[PDB]
Design a protein around this ligand. Structure first.
Ligand SMILES: Cc1cc2nc3c(=O)[nH]c(=O)nc-3n(C[C@H](O)[C@H](O)[C@H](O)COP(=O)(O)O)c2cc1C
Ligand SMILES: O=C1N=C(Nc2ccccc2C(=O)O)[SH]=C1Cc1cccc2ccccc12
Ligand SMILES: O=C(O)c1cc(=O)[nH]c(=O)[nH]1
Length: 365
């Protein structure tokens, strides 16, 4: 198709030449919130449908947290072709996040490093924003386009579980699924909430708040993990997830590692790395988690997805759904239809009736 080619080779390099990464993002969000796109040529086939988390997903490719941090562009993003949308991370109180610059292109690596630090309009602003389209969203969800909301904690917060509980109370009622994000590389001690005893205390509490909501307003709760966990960390997470009945896992966040081979000038910037260099690392974490959970805990695979093959590798490794974020910054919106079209072809090629059949297929070889 001519869009994929026009954006990849002309529009995108020209936007990159003109704007810094954060400016580029601010604008993409604005353009997307307003409707300014084509609307995806691509009609979703029934092959691409998945039932998971107590919902239907028209297609398994979503937009990952971080792009629409404050719930400003949700509708524009469904229009862009994504089959689900996740917003956030959202913190209880507004906060500016880290000082600029805080995001960086590694174009030689097809990667991004960012250290935003949970810049957020805060719960209550985001709450009103979602309330304003609540019903539009109830019909979207009924149609197979669900909404997830990803929760973070304030920098100066003295009680991390309490931040998350507040989150659950305020935005849980407006979400199909909530994410407890304990894997940001950009908030002091946040990733240590991933340790057992701390993870169990926090999630017990989150799940309690969640169960306290009214049934129609009661979201699934997932936990988003780093790709940088030790074997122990992973065993422990798996365990706690089974012990508490956590609804799913998102795998993975960005990596604080710096794989050998990175060429980008800015490769030594502090921050989490996303995009291609993260891909196989995150696919392997999906693999280890699926196995440790016996395939009974849905996983949203995320990290370096940019093609149907990328996606399908994550699905075969155990992901029920996948998300991308960095690919959109290199290739623009056509990447979304590109991934779907290829995923569909690949599924036919390997004799899968649909996505559901491919989920975990590698573990059954
Ligand atoms: C600029 C930027 C901001 C991000 N912000 C968030 C965030 O607030 N919360 C979160 O859970 N993940 C965040 N992520 C991580 C993405 O959700 C995703 O896990 C990661 O980038 C891997 O996917 P990708 O390689 O498709 O970008 C962010 C990523 C980038 C690149
Ligand atoms: O999602 C996008 N992100 C872009 N840049 C970024 C966003 C977040 C972090 C880093 C960047 C970056 O460019 O480094 S550019 C873009 C999407 C896009 C590009 C070109 C035209 C568009 C028109 C409408 C919506 C998105 C568009
Ligand atoms: O806000 C950020 O800096 C951020 C959060 C997160 O979860 N992941 C990430 O890569 N950056």
């Amino acid at each position: 198709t001519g869009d994929e080619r026009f954006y990849a080779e002309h529009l995108m390099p020209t936007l990159q030449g003109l704007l810094d990464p954060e400016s580029a993002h601010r604008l993409a969000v604005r353009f997307t919130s307003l409707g300014l796109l084509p609307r995806a040529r691509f009609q979703d086939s029934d092959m691409l449908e998945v039932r998971v988390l107590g919902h239907k997903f028209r297609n398994p490719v979503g937009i990952a947290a971080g792009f629409d941090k404050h719930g400003e562009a949700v509708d524009g993003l469904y229009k862009m072709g994504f089959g689900f949308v996740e917003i956030g991370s959202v913190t209880p109180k507004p906060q500016e996040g880290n000082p600029r610059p805080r995001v960086f292109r590694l174009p030689e690596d097809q990667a991004v490093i960012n250290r935003y630090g949970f810049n957020s309009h805060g719960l209550s602003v985001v709450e009103h924003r979602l309330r304003a389209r609540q019903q539009k969203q109830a019909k979207l969800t009924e149609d197979g386009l669900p909404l997830g909301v990803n929760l973070g904690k304030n920098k100066t917060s003295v009680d991390a579980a309490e931040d998350y509980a507040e989150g659950v109370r305020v935005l849980g009622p407006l979400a199909d699924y909530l994410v407890v994000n304990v894997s940001s590389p950009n908030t002091a001690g946040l990733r240590s909430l991933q340790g057992k005893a701390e993870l169990r205390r926090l999630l017990t509490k989150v799940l309690q708040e969640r169960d306290g909501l009214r049934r129609v307003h009661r979201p699934a709760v997932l936990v988003k993990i780093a790709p940088d966990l030790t074997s122990q960390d992973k065993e422990d997470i798996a365990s706690v997830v089974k012990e508490l009945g956590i609804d799913g896992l998102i795998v993975t966040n960005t990596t604080v590692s710096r794989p050998a081979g990175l060429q980008g000038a800015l490769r030594s910037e502090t921050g989490g790395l996303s995009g291609k260099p993260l891909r196989d690392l995150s696919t392997q974490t999906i693999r280890e988690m699926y196995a440790l959970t016996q395939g009974r805990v849905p996983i949203i695979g995320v990290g370096g997805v940019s093609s149907g093959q990328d996606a399908l590798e994550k699905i075969r490794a155990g992901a029920s759904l996948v998300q991308l974020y960095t690919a959109l910054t290199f290739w623009g919106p056509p990447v979304v239809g590109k991934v779907k079209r290829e995923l569909e072809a690949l599924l036919k090629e390997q004799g899968f009736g649909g996505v559901t059949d491919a989920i975990g297929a590698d573990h059954r070889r």
